[PDB]
Design a protein around this ligand. Structure first.
Ligand SMILES: CCCCCCCCCCCCCCCCCC(=O)OC[C@H](CO[C@@H]1O[C@H](CO[C@H]2O[C@H](CO)[C@H](O)[C@H](O)[C@H]2O)[C@H](O)[C@H](O)[C@H]1O)OC(=O)CCCCCCCCCCCCCCCCC
Ligand SMILES: CCCCCCCCCCCCCCCCCC(=O)OC[C@H](CO[C@@H]1O[C@H](CO[C@H]2O[C@H](CO)[C@H](O)[C@H](O)[C@H]2O)[C@H](O)[C@H](O)[C@H]1O)OC(=O)CCCCCCCCCCCCCCCCC
Ligand code: CLA
Ligand code: CLA
Ligand code: CLA
Ligand code: CLA
Ligand code: CLA
Ligand code: CLA
Ligand SMILES: CC1=C(/C=C/C(C)=C/C=C/C(C)=C/C=C/C=C(C)/C=C/C=C(C)/C=C/C2=C(C)CCCC2(C)C)C(C)(C)CCC1
Ligand SMILES: CC1=C(/C=C/C(C)=C/C=C/C(C)=C/C=C/C=C(C)/C=C/C=C(C)/C=C/C2=C(C)CCCC2(C)C)C(C)(C)CCC1
Ligand SMILES: CCCCCCCS[C@@H]1O[C@H](CO)[C@@H](O)[C@H](O)[C@H]1O
Ligand SMILES: [Cl-]
Ligand SMILES: [Cl-]
Ligand SMILES: [Fe+2]
Lengths: 80, 34, 137, 451, 334, 342
């Protein structure tokens, strides 16, 4: 042994589940809401199902410039 | 007798905490419709 | 992009009258097309006769014209060769040949309209991919 | 608890069921409970299939494997395999499910409540694996049971409505078998047929008369064999050839089931008689032949002379010769010329495919069938997207023939592994070295060096 | 002892430099026949009409091949699954044109290799060993059966069996991918896990035992002279090896039981390769890899491609090109 | 003597559940971020702007199709740092530009260095020889040649492997179609090392388990071993005889056996890395010149080598327009190579 409390002791203890019957669901629900509120889309810049193309556009908004790439994506997003 | 917060505790939570968060996020994704 | 009423507006007849389909009719059209037609017409081609596809332009040049709801619904009741010269119910699924094509037995007039709508809307979405075959996959 | 840990049994938890080798009462419980699982599945799965069943859709479009087994027996279907009555499917499902409770009850009772060993309770039901006469007697009982089972198939076929006959003159239909094949030269002639192309061993059986008469023979052979084994004890040569232990007997059965699994794989893959294509979908060979037929018909309608049409390679585009000269479909399907099916045979003459019949006598029903089969070829992805690997999503299809062939190959293969595992172990255990080499009696140390 | 009794004693003798045995009685002639035919064919066989379209493919060294391109070419598609022994041909010239050597070789090889597996049980029994080495060998054996027998049966032709050559092997793989999307099949993925993992664990075990060898030699001599064949004492320190690997990851992730460790070393690659064999044996009946072609669709219904669709484009390239003169009708159904 | 360095050294090297060490300062953050970056990207991040692909669970991909995809070809070999001149500190744009790819690749690279340092550190402290670290040079040679050297010789990171299951499959098929990588003798040695390694793993494990001495009464034989026992748990003499009689040769030296187990897969991976270094420059084993001269002059000459080039030609033409969207390839139907019918 290295000193730390055995995992088996911990996960069978009442105090563990008192704490984790709260922390586990809370984190799960936080994750759920990260998606359900749509915040995940805006944080990472991931298109929603309705934002891949403009209505009549059938050309992919590919980045073609290295140093004006950021502005290109911005320009693409304006065109939506 | 046993310590509560350890290096092991941190390592466990660096993995456990985002994992559960991510699983809730992916659970929610299963109801998204185009 | 969205599946708008404009996308869902297709020719009803040879005169120029249009019909606007609901999203529910679109879903039903895809479901029913898969149910009764896709085994041969997946992606708007024709597996057992690749010369003839379900592109709107091809349908328009059919006899009688099939680039509208009426033409397509009629095709599903009494299918003909591309020139209108021969009735092919005996070798093509139709209401008229529901006895030998049993999947046609439970297709209502409403169902036929949905399938017809699917055939017309799909290329408006997918463009040349519809009726294109593997080249466009 | 007796023998229910590693220290007392010698077996770890993961080999827990080996603790049952010499506990006949609990082991009987294990078996009866297991049989309850098999019967449970047959019942519950049937009901599931029926609940999901759309009668006007082909069965093979619906992921069904059990209803096709019921239909093949002549229950619930009419001409062309059309479903006329789903109630027989319901009966089979319900009765199996009901029966599974009874077996479950017996299994659970014997496993955890009844006598742990049967030997002190009953001389009849108790047994020692090393008792060769008792072993052959139980074997004899089961052989009789199996022989009766085979005769039940005969009974259905001959006296209780018949079986579905894909070959029935005028088109596929349920048919009562009045004249089963009893001629031992025909029945046992199948057994001596090469397993290779154009022959196909027992998988070649192509008419119900041979199927029924085969089961008459098997029914009587099993009963006679069972009686024989109740009344005799293994001969000297048999005693010296075999290992006599529970694990040895398990291993022989494992090898047997592996063999059977492999045979069933080829049966469902190639045979369209006892697996009618009306219910199971076309065979791989069939669908490929049907594509050639489809385009022959199409192109001939367009004006093509299909007999004289030279393909790119110089072989006939539609029609060519087999290596023995028979007229056969061209293209890659040249490999499938051994195929025989009711939609195709009308075009076949003594020389193979008959050009006159091809030009003049192809009926719309043949065209329909060829088109149906060409577009229901047994190709599809694991997530049930029909067609070649490159197909786009749309058609939800994997043929029952593929499901049945693959599953049984996997099962047959692992059962061969199991045979080797248990046969090897049984040999080692009987000889007394299954637990390792005796450090003080290491056999190699008493042998001369090889060099 | 009579003639038979002495013969039996010789056959089963534990003192033969190479064990013969009863499986050996079948193994020896079949492997010799397969080997001799293979060598002659690889050197000297004329071109073979693999696809039955009178387009003979040259496989042998004397007919313009090297080691990498050379093959014993599969038998003609015209034959299918028909048994094509020498005596079924009008002449050796015909037999060769149609790829008779392939069938002779694979049938003799598969029988001999099955007997090789049986022989491994057999000797283990004669030596008082435990019996399961042969079970480990069933993994590669099953894989040989998959590519030489099961796949041809499923597809209806020995022309689709794997060629006996280096480039012919790659041909088999590329076409297999086109037709079954094997990369997207979980049994092949398990197979990769088995072989990648088997290599990993091989390097792992090799490194850990070597790391903990007990000092028995001087600086100037090879440490291998520190172990003597048949010594009773173990040659490395497993407690030290465990003490290392348990600290590399964590204690309970490392083995301290050598028997359990070696079981794992046996089981990981063997089970994985079983699944690989089963991949090929079940794709033999066209239950193919996962198909996610056009699985992701936007609000309007535009297909949004994934890496699956890019795989599809590669597969289409293989599909349209393979056996370029063999197909007359739009679907490749076997 | 007992200054802050020595005190820090004490704490780093404490015998705890997860050993840290000096190497842990490099290892743990880089490994955590590489893994975290992958999980983040595959869960939430698109490849729409770099590849025209969906690549995350959020977009509807599954475990097999998600990926952290490489940056667009126009990025060249930009390190693509968050604060760099492309993203300019904007986290969202950085994700859209494929910044997570270089993030994962680079943290992954320093992570592997930390892991191999960890292998050295632990071995020194426990007093074993560092053969495990040495064997790990093979995974390092592979990661470096494939994920760094290969794209660095090419036009951009775009052509590096993308971090995903299907994306890696795409990488395999690209290498077949463009590099004819199966024909490369360095890849062939790699295959021999991997399959040979797996063979050695299986055969050694099985041999030990089937030459065990009976050291207990249990029919389950695992409990009959003690870590501290002096004796070998299996018979090398019996193992040797078995193989000598079965295969013709057998190991007789246990130290050689185990070294050979290191050598085989380690050498194989090294060889495959050398091949990929060549492919970085399109320096392929693509052709056999003699085969081509013969085939060009003689339209009846065909081998499996010529058959495979036709497949490559199909792969290239059919996959290139979507796989290399920056090229704006438009191949009209008529130019596409196809055999008959298909
Ligand atoms: C006990 C120990 C045995 C040891 C002895 C070994 C030596 C002899 C065994 C030979 C091995 C089999 C090779 C032939 C395989 C084959 O082509 O078998 C296929 C045949 C079926 O043949 C087909 O049978 C067909 C019958 O259908 C015909 O008839 C039908 C009737 O409806 C239809 O009309 C149909 O259209 C029509 O064509 C046709 O004749 C086809 O041309 C013909 O190819 O199956 C069959 O005979 C059944 C045989 C199933 C065996 C499958 C092989 C599996 C073994 C590998 C296991 C892996 C090992 C792992 C090691 C670790
Ligand atoms: C061993 C194990 C150890 C463990 C591994 C440790 C991991 C540490 C991580 C280090 C990462 C290094 C990143 C290298 C980035 C790079 O190189 O990025 C590339 C740049 C060069 O930029 C490229 O330059 C190209 C050529 O441009 C030139 O030519 C153009 C056309 O004519 C124009 O004129 C242009 O203006 C002009 O600059 C293109 O522009 C490309 O788009 C652009 O990306 O070089 C540079 O930064 C630096 C170039 C010189 C230094 C190279 C040292 C390291 C690289 C060794 C690999 C060699 C690869 C050969 C392949 C075999
Ligand atoms: C009639 C068939 C049959 C019977 C009656 C037995 C019976 C026995 N075997 Mg044998 N075996 C068989 C077939 C059979 N086996 C096959 C086909 C194989 C090849 C794989 C084996 C390989 C085998 C080995 C290696 C061993 C045995 C052993 C044993 C004994 C203990 C079994 C036990 O406790 O397992 C307990 C059961 C488990 C631990 C669970 C196994 C889980 C499997 C691997 C997963 C199955 C996949 C499933 C379909 C999917 C899971 C769904 C999931 C999502 C929930 C017992 C005498 C042991 C022995 O030799 O005793 C003397 C032993 O070591 N068997
Ligand atoms: C087909 C599956 C199957 C069957 C039929 C059996 C059968 C049996 N096992 Mg094996 N076993 C299996 C799989 C199976 N096993 C697997 C997968 C493993 C690995 C996890 C094992 C590991 C194992 C070990 C280690 C042991 C057994 C033992 C036993 C026997 C006694 C069990 C006992 O003492 O219960 C005790 C448990 C209970 C009393 C709890 C209730 C159990 C009941 C039976 C549940 C039934 C529920 C059911 C839904 C009710 C329906 C009733 C309805 C019809 C009215 C019993 C005959 C023991 C033995 O050999 O005895 C000497 C033993 O030691 N098994
Ligand atoms: C003979 C076996 C067998 C066969 C051929 C089929 C075939 C079929 N089934 Mg049935 N079924 C079975 C047994 C079988 N099933 C069992 C055991 C159950 C209980 C769970 C069911 C319950 C069931 C349901 C609820 C449904 C089906 C459905 C279907 C259809 C689609 C299947 C599918 O999509 O799979 C997807 C493929 C997989 C899930 C992969 C299976 C992977 C397994 C675990 C690998 C096994 C390997 C080996 C045994 C492991 C051993 C390890 C070794 C090392 C020891 C198809 C016709 C569907 C249908 O269409 O109904 C109308 C459907 O809804 N089946
Ligand atoms: C093959 C499986 C099998 C076998 C060999 C046995 C054998 C035994 N059982 Mg068990 N049991 C079983 C399954 C089995 N049972 C099932 C399915 C159930 C649920 C009904 C039970 C419930 C049960 C109980 C409650 C008891 C036993 C008892 C006994 C013992 C004495 C029985 C006797 O003397 O009957 C003499 C013969 C008869 C009474 C006539 C038999 C009538 C049968 C059912 C006619 C049909 C036969 C036909 C072949 C079955 C086809 C079914 C098939 C399709 C599956 C004996 C050890 C007793 C015990 O162990 O004592 C302590 C006991 O109390 N059994
Ligand atoms: C489950 C079915 C079953 C089982 C397990 C047994 C078991 C046994 N029987 Mg019995 N038998 C059965 C059914 C069965 N029998 C039936 C239905 C009949 C009626 C015909 C008989 C009539 C019978 C007789 C007359 C005798 C036995 C004998 C025996 C014993 C040794 C037999 C032997 O060595 O076979 C292995 C076979 C051989 C050693 C012969 C040569 C093997 C060749 C190579 C087989 C060729 C086939 C090959 C595998 C491939 C070809 C494919 C094939 C499917 C065509 C053994 C206890 C003997 C005994 O001792 O009686 C008390 C004996 O004399 N049985
Ligand atoms: C040991 C752990 C470690 C290592 C080796 C790295 C290494 C790397 N990181 Mg990662 N990172 C880490 C931990 C680590 N990181 C942690 C804990 C976090 C959470 C905050 C991050 C979050 C992170 C992000 C968001 C990014 C990186 C990025 C990078 C890369 C560029 C770093 C750089 O250029 O800095 C340069 C700085 C140094 C080398 C330190 C200089 C120290 C010298 C010796 C002293 C001189 C400094 C002096 C005191 C200051 C005076 C300046 C004054 C004149 C203004 C490189 C692969 C980038 C990358 O991946 O892009 C693709 C990137 O975008 N990291
Ligand atoms: C020994 C053992 C075991 C085993 C067990 C077993 C295997 C069993 C069983 C069992 C069973 C085998 C059972 C059963 C059952 C059943 C039931 C309970 C039933 C029923 C039914 C019903 C109720 C029905 C109904 C209906 C109808 C009538 C009609 C229609 C609809 C419905 C479906 C609703 C185990 C592993 C745990 C382990 C330990 C020991
Ligand atoms: C990027 C970045 C960062 C970071 C981050 C991180 C660090 C993260 C993380 C993360 C994480 C850490 C996550 C997670 C996760 C997870 C998951 C999502 C999971 C899962 C799972 C599963 C689902 C499972 C399953 C399975 C398996 C595997 C096996 C067998 C069976 C089963 C089926 C159970 C920073 C800010 C610095 C900055 C910039 C960028
Ligand atoms: C983290 C970087 C490691 C560089 C090590 C340089 C140590 S520096 C060294 O440290 C001693 C105490 O540790 C002091 O007593 C001494 O004054 C100081 O020079
Ligand atoms: Cl090819
Ligand atoms: Cl064809
Ligand atoms: Fe070892």
């Amino acid at each position: 042994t290295t000193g730390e409390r055995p995992f088996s002791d911990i996960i069978t203890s009442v105090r563990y589940w008192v704490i984790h019957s709260i922390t586990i669901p809370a984190l799960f629900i936080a994750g759920w809401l990260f998606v359900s509120t749509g915040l995940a889309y805006d944080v990472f810049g991931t298109p929603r199902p309705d934002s891949y193309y403009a209505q009549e556009q059938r050309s992919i908004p590919l980045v073609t410039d290295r140093f004006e790439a950021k502005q290109q994506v911005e320009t693409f997003l304006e065109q939506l | 007798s046993y310590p509560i917060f350890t290096v092991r505790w941190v390592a466990v939570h660096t993995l456990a905490v985002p994992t559960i968060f991510f699983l809730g996020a992916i659970a929610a994704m299963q109801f998204i419709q185009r | 992009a969205e599946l708008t009423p404009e996308v869902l507006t297709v020719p009803l007849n040879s005169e120029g009258k249009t019909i606007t389909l609901t999203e529910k009719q679109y879903l039903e059209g895809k479901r029913l097309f898969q149910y009764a037609c896709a085994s041969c017409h997946v992606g708007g081609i024709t597996k057992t006769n690749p010369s003839l596809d379900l592109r709107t332009e091809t349908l328009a040049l059919a006899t009688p014209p099939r680039d509208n709801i009426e033409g397509l619904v009629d095709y599903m009741k009494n299918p003909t060769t591309y020139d209108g010269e021969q009735e092919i119910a005996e070798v093509h699924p139709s209401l008229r040949s529901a006895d030998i094509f049993p999947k046609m037995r439970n297709l209502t007039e409403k169902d036929l309209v949905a399938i017809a709508g699917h055939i017309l809307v799909e290329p408006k979405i997918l463009g040349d991919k519809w009726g294109g075959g593997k080249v466009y996959y | 608890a007796t023998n229910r840990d590693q220290e007392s049994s010698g077996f770890a938890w993961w080999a827990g069921n080996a603790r049952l080798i010499n506990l006949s009462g609990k082991l009987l419980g294990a078996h009866v409970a297991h049989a309850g699982l098999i019967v449970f599945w047959a019942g519950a799965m049937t009901l599931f299939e029926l609940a999901h069943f759309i009668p006007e859709k082909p069965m093979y479009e619906q992921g069904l494997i059990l209803i096709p087994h019921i239909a093949t027996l002549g229950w619930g279907v009419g001409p062309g395999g059309e479903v006329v009555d789903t109630f027989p499917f319901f009966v089979v499902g319900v009765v199996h499910l009901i029966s599974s409770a009874v077996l479950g009850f017996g299994g659970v009772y014997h496993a955890i409540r009844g006598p742990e060993t049967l030997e002190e309770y009953s001389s009849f039901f108790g047994y020692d694996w090393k008792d060769k006469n008792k072993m052959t007697t139980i074997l004899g009982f089961h052989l009789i049971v199996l022989g009766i089972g085979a005769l039940l198939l005969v009974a259905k076929a001959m006296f209780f409505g018949g079986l579905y006959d894909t070959w029935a003159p005028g088109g596929g239909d349920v048919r009562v078998i009045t004249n089963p094949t009893l001629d031992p030269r025909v029945i046992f002639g199948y057994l001596l047929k090469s397993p290779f192309g154009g022959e196909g061993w027992i998988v070649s059986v192509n008419n119900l008369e041979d199927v029924v008469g085969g089961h008459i023979w098997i029914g009587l052979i099993c009963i006679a064999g069972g009686i024989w084994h109740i009344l005799t004890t293994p001969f000297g040569w048999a005693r010296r050839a075999f290992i006599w232990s529970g694990e040895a007997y398990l291993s022989y059965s494992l090898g047997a089931l592996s063999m059977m699994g492999f045979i069933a794989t080829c049966f469902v893959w190639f045979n369209n008689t006892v697996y009618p294509s009306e219910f199971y979908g076309p065979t791989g060979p069939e669908a490929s032949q049907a594509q050639a037929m489809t385009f022959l018909i199409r192109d001939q309608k367009l004006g093509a002379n299909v007999g004289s049409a030279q393909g790119p390679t110089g072989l006939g585009k539609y029609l060519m010769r087999s290596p023995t000269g028979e007229i056969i479909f061209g293209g890659e399907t040249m490999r499938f010329w051994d195929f025989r099916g009711p939609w195709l045979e009308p075009l076949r003459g003594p020389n193979g495919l008959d050009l006159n019949k091809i030009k003049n006598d192809i009926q719309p029903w043949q065209e329909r069938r060829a088109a149906e089969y060409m577009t229901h070829a047994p190709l599809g992805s694991l997530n049930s997207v029909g067609g070649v690997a490159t197909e786009i999503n749309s058609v939800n299809f994997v043929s029952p023939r593929s499901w049945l062939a693959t599953s049984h190959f996997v099962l047959a293969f692992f059962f061969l592994v199991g045979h080797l595992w248990h046969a090897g172990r049984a040999r080692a255990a009987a000889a007394g070295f299954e637990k390792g080499i005796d450090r003080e009696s290491e056999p190699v140390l008493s042998m001369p060096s090889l060099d | 002892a009579n003639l038979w009794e002495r013969f039996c004693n010789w056959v089963t003798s534990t003192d033969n430099r190479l064990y013969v045995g009863w499986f050996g009685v079948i193994m020896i002639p079949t492997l010799l026949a397969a080997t001799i035919c293979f060598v002659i064919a690889f050197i000297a066989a004329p071109p073979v009409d693999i696809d039955g379209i009178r387009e003979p493919v040259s496989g042998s060294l004397l007919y313009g091949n090297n080691i990498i391109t050379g093959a014993v070419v599969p038998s003609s598609n015209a034959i299918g699954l028909h048994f094509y022994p020498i005596w079924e041909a009008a002449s050796l010239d015909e037999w060769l044109y149609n790829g008779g050597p392939y069938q002779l070789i694979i049938f003799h090889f598969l029988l001999g290799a099955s007997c090789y597996m049986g022989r491994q049980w057999e000797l283990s029994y004669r030596l008082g060993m435990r019996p399961w080495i042969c079970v480990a060998y069933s993994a590669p054996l099953a894989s040989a059966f998959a590519v030489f027998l099961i796949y041809p049966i499923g597809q209806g032709s020995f022309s689709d069996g794997m060629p006996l050559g280096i480039s012919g092997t790659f041909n088999f793989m590329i076409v297999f991918q086109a037709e079954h999307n094997i990369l997207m099949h979980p049994f092949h993925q398990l197979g990769v896990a088995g072989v990648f993992g088997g290599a990993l664990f091989c390097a792992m075990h090799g490194s850990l035992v070597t790391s903990s060898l007990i000092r028995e030699t001087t600086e100037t001599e090879s440490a291998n002279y520190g172990y003597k064949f048949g010594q009773e004492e173990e040659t490395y320190n497993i407690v030290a090896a465990h003490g290392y690997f348990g600290r590399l990851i964590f204690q309970y992730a490392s083995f301290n039981n050598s028997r359990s460790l070696h079981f794992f070393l046996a089981a990981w690659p063997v089970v994985g390769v079983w699944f690989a064999a089963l991949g090929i044996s079940t794709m033999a009946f066209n239950l193919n890899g996962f198909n996610f072609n056009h699985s992701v669709i936007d609000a309007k219904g535009n297909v949004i491609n994934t890496w699956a669709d890019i795989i599809n484009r590669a597969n289409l390239g293989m599909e349209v090109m393979h056996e370029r003169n063999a197909h007359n009708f739009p679907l490749d159904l076997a | 003597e007992r200054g802050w360095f020595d005190i820090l050294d004490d704490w780093l090297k404490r015998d705890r559940f997860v050993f840290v060490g000096w190497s842990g300062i490099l290892l743990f953050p880089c490994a955590y971020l590489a893994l975290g970056g992958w999980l983040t990207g595959t869960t939430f991040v698109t490849s729409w702007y770099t590849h025209g692909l969906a690549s995350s669970y959020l977009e509807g991909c599954n475990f097999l199709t998600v990926a952290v995809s490489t940056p667009a070809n126009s990025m060249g070999h930009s390190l693509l740092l968050l604060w760099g001149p492309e993203a300019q500190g904007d986290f969202t744009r950085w994700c859209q530009l494929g910044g997570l790819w270089t993030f994962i690749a680079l943290h992954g690279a320093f992570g592997l260095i930390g892991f191999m340092l960890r292998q050295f550190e632990i071995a020194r402290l426990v007093g074993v020889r560092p053969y495990n670290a040495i064997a790990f040079s093979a995974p390092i040679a592979v990661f470096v040649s494939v994920f760094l050297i290969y794209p660095l010789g090419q036009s951009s990171w775009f052509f590096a492997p993308s971090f995903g299951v299907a994306a890696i499959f795409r990488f395999l098929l690209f290498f077949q179609g463009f590099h004819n990588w199966t024909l490369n003798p360095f890849h062939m040695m790699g295959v021999a090392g991997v399959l040979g390694g797996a063979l050695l793993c299986a055969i050694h494990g099985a041999t030990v388990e089937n030459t065990l001495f009976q050291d207990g009464e249990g029919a389950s034989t695992f409990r009959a071993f003690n870590p501290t026992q002096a004796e070998e748990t299996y018979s090398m003499v019996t193992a040797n005889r078995f193989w000598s009689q079965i295969f013709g040769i057998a190991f007789s030296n246990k130290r050689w056996l185990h070294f050979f187990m290191l050598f085989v897969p380690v050498t194989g991976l090294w060889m495959s890395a050398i091949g990929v270094v060549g492919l970085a420059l399109n320096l392929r084993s693509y052709d056999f010149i003699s085969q081509e001269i013969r085939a060009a002059e003689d339209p009846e000459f065909e081998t499996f080598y010529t058959k495979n080039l036709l497949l490559n030609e199909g792969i290239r033409a059919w996959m290139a327009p979507q796989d290399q969207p920056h090229e704006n390839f438009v191949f009209p139907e008529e130019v596409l190579p196809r055999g008959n019918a298909l």
